[PDB]
Design a protein around this nucleic acid. Structure first.
Ligand SMILES: [Mg+2]
Ligand SMILES: [Zn+2]
Lengths: 56, 134, 87, 56, 156, 44
RNA sequence: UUUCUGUCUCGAACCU
């Protein structure tokens, strides 16, 4: 029950929530710091090589 | 201000409303690991073979404290301790990763057993933000 | 054993595509395009593999098939071109 | 996570501050109140994972 | 025979026997005709934590072992008559790094800072005013010695 | 001005391998004062 | 031109 049904995981964050009527319904605001730590592994293609090289 | 949130005036915040001081203290002891073997509060050095941390170490002075007045952050080391190993290794306590500020005070004394005991106190201003609760 | 497999006729499952099949196919095409698979559609500067996948599914130009597992282990074999992606 | 809609995929908007911001109308299915509540953000690590979260 | 085995504290068994006999001999020296009926007492090393005693009735061992520490008088048991020959058989057992700096073309200008890391062409400094780390080009920072005073540009 | 006493409020300027007691009084709390480095803050 | 630390275990208090 503590390590198989439910367990731990990286690539995640927890923090306080505040209301925001100037945000779309399916949108969610992320702190700049939390965005800086969290990452998505994106693979290099011709279709994003320029932006990925800029990010690197 | 919805769901019993609140809208707080920024001008009031930064003119004095609900600011506060955060004091946090850390401890270290010169624990007797091995008869006639004691740690010495000093600055660790890369030249001898120690397992020092990746945080900065220049904040320390020769004495082994951080020369109060200096400030710290992240993983800066607050007390510089080296444990002999049988050349030596690091056992310095780093500052908390999530907390940072200016060292207000440092204490050096002897405990009951005579091992040197050090108590370093760090001050920060903490201002209301959105996530702060009231 | 192939006897469990159903031929192209006598299939009883829905031709209308299920949301889970849609999601898996968009994801699978998304891996394929993100890792340099050929793209079956003319690209108007699109750069997000998920968007390219949605475009291919819109044109029914996705070379993928589904074994639709009957719970006894048999399966119905349904091609993406013929799967009516109405929703 | 008492019920099904208490775990929903949102679109990131990087927003400079220390708190998750979320549209107000999504507080009902979450049973959220911004009264010190905290919430949990899980970042997918694959194109399958993103496709599932966006489409399902 | 009548032979009862009593639990005791492991490892001190000989001390228990020696104390028991010295008590018995002192009791005999003080007592006259009517002596305590303890035929003998002994121990066993490899069956450690246990004593064996012979006596006719349990009250004798109770009135012997009162006040004796490290013996569990409450925990005693009969040794079977068939078991005795086998129990008694003989054969058993970068210069800019870590320097005070002042920023010069940014919003944080005139502010002390400490250089924490340099990724090349851009130095990260923790601000000596704010609890925030900032990246700024290292050429446009005037560096200061350990104490304040003269401000030296990037020429060291 | 390496260290100051807690009650005597007196400098000690001591070194390593020395006792951590105040010389003037019996007390051995032994604080120490600000560094000689310049320290700067704003009003924010 | 020398880098992937690091912990458990019994509780206590508090937040949603
Ligand atoms: Mg709440
Ligand atoms: Zn004194």
């Amino acid at each position: 029950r503590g390590n198989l049904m439910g367990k731990r995981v990286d690539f995640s964050a927890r923090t306080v929530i505040s209301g925001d009527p100037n945000l779309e319904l399916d949108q969610v605001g992320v702190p700049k710091s939390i965005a800086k730590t969290l990452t998505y592994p994106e693979v290099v293609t011709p279709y994003n090589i320029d932006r990925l090289t800029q990010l690197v | 201000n919805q769901e019993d949130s609140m809208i707080m005036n920024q001008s009031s915040i930064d003119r004095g409303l609900f600011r506060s001081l955060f004091f946090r203290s850390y401890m270290d002891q010169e624990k007797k690991y091995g008869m006639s073997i004691t740690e010495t509060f000093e600055k660790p050095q890369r030249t001898n073979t120690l397992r020092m941390k990746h945080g900065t170490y220049d904040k320390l002075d020769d004495d082994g404290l951080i020369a109060p007045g200096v400030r710290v952050s992240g993983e800066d080391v607050i007390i510089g301790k080296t444990t002999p190993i049988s050349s030596k290794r690091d056992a310095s306590t780093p500052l908390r990763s999530t907390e940072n500020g200016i060292v207000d005070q440092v204490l050096v004394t002897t405990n009951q057993d005579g091992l040197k005991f050090v108590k370093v106190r760090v001050r920060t201003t903490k201002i209301p933000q959105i996530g702060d609760k009231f | 054993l192939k006897e469990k497999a159903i031929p192209k006729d006598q299939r009883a499952t829905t031709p209308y595509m299920t949301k889970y099949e849609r999601a898996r196919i968009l994801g699978t095409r998304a891996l394929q395009i993100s890792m340099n698979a050929p793209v079956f559609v003319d690209l108007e500067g699109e750069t997000d593999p998920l968007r390219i996948a949605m475009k291919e599914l819109a044109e029914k130009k996705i070379p993928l098939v589904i074994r639709r597992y009957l719970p006894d282990g048999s399966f119905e074999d349904w091609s993406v071109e013929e799967l009516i992606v109405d929703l | 996570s008492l019920h099904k809609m208490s775990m929903m995929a949102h679109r990131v908007k990087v927003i400079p501050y220390s708190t998750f911001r979320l549209n107000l109308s999504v507080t009902s299915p979450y049973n959220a109140d911004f009264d010190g509540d905290e919430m949990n953000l899980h970042v997918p690590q694959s194109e399958e994972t993103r496709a599932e979260l966006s489409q399902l | 025979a009548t032979i009862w085995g009593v639990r005791c504290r492991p490892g001190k068994e000989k001390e228990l026997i020696r104390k028991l006999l010295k008590k018995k001999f002192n009791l005999d020296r003080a007592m006259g005709k009517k002596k305590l009926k303890i035929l003998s007492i002994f121990q066993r090393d490899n069956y450690t934590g246990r004593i064996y005693i012979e006596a006719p009735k349990q009250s004798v061992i109770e009135k012997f072992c009162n006040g004796v520490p490290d013996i569990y008088i409450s925990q005693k048991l009969l040794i079977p008559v068939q078991e005795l020959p086998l129990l008694l058989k003989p054969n058993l057992e970068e210069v800019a790094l870590g320097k005070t700096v002042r920023i010069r073309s940014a919003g944080y200008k005139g502010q002390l800072g400490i250089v924490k890391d340099v990724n090349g062409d851009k130095a990260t400094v923790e601000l000596h005013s704010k609890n925030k780390h900032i990246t700024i080009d290292k050429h446009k920072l005037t560096y200061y010695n350990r104490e304040g005073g003269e401000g030296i540009t990037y020429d060291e | 001005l390496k260290y100051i006493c807690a009650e005597c409020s007196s400098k000690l300027s001591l070194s390593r391998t020395d006792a951590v007691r105040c010389k003037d009084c019996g007390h051995r709390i032994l604080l120490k004062a600000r560094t000689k480095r310049l320290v700067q803050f704003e009003a924010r």
